[PDB]
Amino acid sequence: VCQYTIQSLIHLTGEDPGFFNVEIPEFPFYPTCNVCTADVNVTINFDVGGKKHQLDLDFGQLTPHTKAVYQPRGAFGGSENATNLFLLELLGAGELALTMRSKKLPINVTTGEEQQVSLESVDVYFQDVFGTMWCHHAEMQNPVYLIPETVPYIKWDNCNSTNITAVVRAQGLDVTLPLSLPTSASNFSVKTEMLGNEIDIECIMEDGEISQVLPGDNKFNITCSGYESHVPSGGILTSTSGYAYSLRLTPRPVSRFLGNNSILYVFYSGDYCIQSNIVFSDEIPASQDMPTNTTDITYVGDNATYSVPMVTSEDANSPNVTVTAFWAWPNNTETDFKCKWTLTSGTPSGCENISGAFASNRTFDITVSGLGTAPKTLIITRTATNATTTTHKVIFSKAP
């Protein structure tokens, strides 16, 4: 039973790089919670020559504080080693991505249907610490056919090695490379390919070559093959102010299916080629916590109040509204996450020293009791149907 469902529409444009990447940005990752977990399952919806076929993947319990990359714990309806064809990755700021290999079939099909498998949609099911079931439906604008094949190893001759490592963090590659050219601001063209473990990503300059290179930074967009990220891919050509050129490349998404010690080839013209080894940071890039607004509240006595307004895009006639609260750095998943309110609800059992109620305004007034002398921080989250989950960090401190 889904309490909130997010819808997305995805369209594959360029060539298939060997993986399909689906971003899921709207599930709650609660801040100041070493102990918060999330149960995640995924359903892949295939069409096989007109016949519907669902692949159910079980990713177990996410533990964002300690692990950023997840493989399926099990698969139902899939081929052998289907669990090896999918990755779930935490991207930071409450976002995650689902990645599937595109050139190996994850389901069983008959002789003759091997080229008739198309991906229709992906459903992601996400149950948070408060018991709320979240769902994401990613629809393909057009069903995308899987073309199974083995990708041969390819290496490019006549490419200068650099000692500079291209480091990928949360599917974003970042690297700055020194180039040299006879001409000097002289147009500039660059394309890249990232090759490894049967993955082949090609990135090119959208808007074409740089016809006149200005001094300083020359920002230019680049488009990589596969499903595009909502964060744009880009690069910068730094010119000295013969003449020095520095090339910053920030393409995304770059899947760790490439493996460590895959190779980034940079072909540029003013073809010259430099190659750099790619490494995938196993460490989390940044805090996975969803972004929050912080408010400092003072109080006298042991009672304090905070009013939670409607969230952005929350309509006055929203079928479902949910407000939740917990004290920062909770210790016990069994007793610290009972403070959840819906439009029909009371302060549940086990929610101690906190009261809340919706007004006719749909404003949610929360009151905290038994406040000691030290500052205490309350993490308040509000969601509404087809609205934006918003988390408030409210620090209650004794009036001076």
Partner 1 sequence: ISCGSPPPILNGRISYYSTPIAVGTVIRYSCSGTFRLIGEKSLLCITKDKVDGTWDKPAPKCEYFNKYSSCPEPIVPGGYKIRGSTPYRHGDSVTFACKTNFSMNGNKSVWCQANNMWGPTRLPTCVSV
Indicate whether 269 belongs to the interface with partner 1 (CB under 8 A). Answer: yes
Whose tokens are 């090695």? That residue is 161
First to last CA, the chain: 48
Q: What angle do CA 103, 107, 111 make, to 5 degrees?
A: 85
Stretch (H or E) spanning 42: strand 38-48
Instruction: Give the other-Cβ count within 10 Å of 352's Cβ.
Output: 11
Among 160, 241, 317, 349, indicate the residue that binds ligand NAG (CB under 6 A): 160
11 binds, among partner 1, ligand NAG, none (CB under 5 to 8 A by kind): partner 1
Quick one: 207 or 283, whose CB is closer to partner 1?
A: 207
Does residue number 298 form part of the binding site for ligand NAG (CB under 6 A)? no
Contact partner at residue 115 from partner 1, ligand NAG, none, CB < 5 to 8 Å by partner kind: partner 1
Mode of pairing for the β-strands spanning 293-299 and 216-224: unpaired
DSSP code per residue over 318-383: -S-EEEEEEESS---TTTS---EEESS----TT--SEEEEE-TTS-EEEEE-S--SS-EEEEEEEE
Binding mask 275-294 for ligand NAG (x = CB under 6 A): ----xx-x--------xxx-
Q: Residue 398 CA to chain centroid, in angstroms? A: 39
Measure the CA–CA gap between 212 and 197, rounded to whole angstroms.
Answer: 38
**Residue with smaller CB distance to ligand NAG, 22 or 82:** 82
Task: Tell me which residues in 239-258 interact with ligand NAG (CB under 6 A).
Answer: none
Partner that binds at residue 32, options partner 1, ligand NAG, none, CB closer than 5 to 8 Å by kind = none
Closer by beta carbon to ligand NAG, 112 or else 301: 301
CA distances to 24, 88, 170, 309, 381 from 126, rounded to whole Å, are 11, 12, 20, 25, 16
Residue of the chain from 52, 111, 155, 160 that contacts partner 1 (CB under 8 A)? 155
| Part in contact with ligand NAG (CB under 6 A); list of ranges 15-23, 96-104, 183-191, 358-366 | 358-366
User: Could you give the string, one character per residue 189-208, with x where binding to partner 1 holds by CB under 8 A and - elsewhere?
Assistant: xxx----------------x
Contacting partner 1 (CB under 8 A), which of 4, 268, 306, 326?
Answer: 268
Q: Which is nearer to ligand NAG, 3 or 32 (CB)?
A: 3
Question: Residue 256: helix, strand or coil by DSSP?
Answer: helix
Question: Considering only residues 51-90, where is the footprint of ligand NAG by CB under 6 A?
Answer: 58, 74, 77, 79-80
Residues 99-118 that bind ligand NAG (CB under 6 A): 108
- Which lies closer to ligand NAG via its Cβ, residue 143 or residue 342? 342
Q: Which of residues 71-130 bind partner 1 (CB under 8 A)?
A: 115
Distance CA 193, CA 278 (A): 11
Is residue 389 within 8 A of residue 310, CB to CB? The reply is no
The DSSP secondary-structure symbol of 13 reads: -
Interaction between residue 14 and ligand NAG (CB under 6 A): no
Nearer to partner 1, 16 or 56 (CB): 16
What's the DSSP call for residue 60?
A: E
Closest-CA residue to 375 (of 394, 397, 393): 397
Name which of 159 and 231 has its Cβ closer to ligand NAG: 159
Token pair for 5: 């469902």
Q: Which residues bind ligand NAG (CB under 6 A)?
A: 1, 3, 39, 41, 58, 74, 77, 79-80, 108, 125, 127, 158-163, 219-221, 234, 260, 272-273, 279-280, 282, 291-293, 301, 303, 319-320, 355, 359, 361, 363, 367, 385, 390-391
